[PDB]
Design a protein around this ligand. Sequence first.
Ligand SMILES: [Ca+2]
Length: 353
Amino acid sequence: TAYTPLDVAQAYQFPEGLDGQGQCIAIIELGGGYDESLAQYFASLGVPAPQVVSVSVDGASNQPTGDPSGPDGEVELDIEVAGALAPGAKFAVYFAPNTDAGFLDAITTAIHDPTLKPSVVSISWGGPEDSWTSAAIAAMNRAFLDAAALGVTVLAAAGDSGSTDGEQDGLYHVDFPAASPYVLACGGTRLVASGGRIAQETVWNDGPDGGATGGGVSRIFPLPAWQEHANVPPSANPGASSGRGVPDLAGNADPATGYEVVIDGEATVIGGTSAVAPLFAALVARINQKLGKAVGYLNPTLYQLPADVFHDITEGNNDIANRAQIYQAGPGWDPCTGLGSPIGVRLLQALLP
Ligand SMILES: [Ca+2]
């Protein structure tokens, strides 16, 4: 199976009549490029190609490498998914070197950008939280904090290597920046839909060889107040305390039921949690447009909303390391899919004045 991004937005009942006009979505990139074949693809979808402007950071810039398996794959997937679904939005793509500094610097640049003022920041890059310097973590978090104060929604993909996050030391790890309490962490599912109805939605897990959604409990960031009613367990690692549970929301990421994109001029099908942050970023822009105001930092509200605002995933696990089924999805918040997939019209309604 394959879907267009529009197929997936209908399953998730995105609000109609809204295309993100008046909103600017920042997308962070740590490599590659795109070619402005993007218009071609949006044409093929029957939607207008939005305005896309690239921004140089720390000397880096829009430079496609030709390899659909390199960063170009991340960049164009990111732009195609949010752009297809928020085509009235303006797209600001910040290119920075793939490092500690560049990543921080691209995020700080976007958030504070006085020309383009994105109201949403989508991120599809990261690494095990335990892999980041102390200083990069703190800096990254204060950047997110600054985003919340400016009414900017920051969304991050939770990872494509299951509960172990590609670390082969035998322990469970969560990815950063999705582990930041100030980020909307986006995990992944396997979606079977049609007629705009969800027939089946389960944890994305294609074992060691095909990826799984990241998800779990942070051993660096404390359980936030607003997560206290979400039955987050302690980290499964020995001795581990209470910590921020990852993720908050989840959506179609299984490449087996993936997104029809064009990458480096080739038609192909792709998944990963990489696509879910751009997906919900478009959701949030349509909502800001309807409301006339940026919703900014959403995690405290989301965990206070009625549960029926979300489609709950309750089956499956994100373990690709062993047979212990860590972690398992369940009724309500769980460490594979968080609150579940958002029901667009219901999320907008809950937030209307
Ligand atoms: Ca659940």
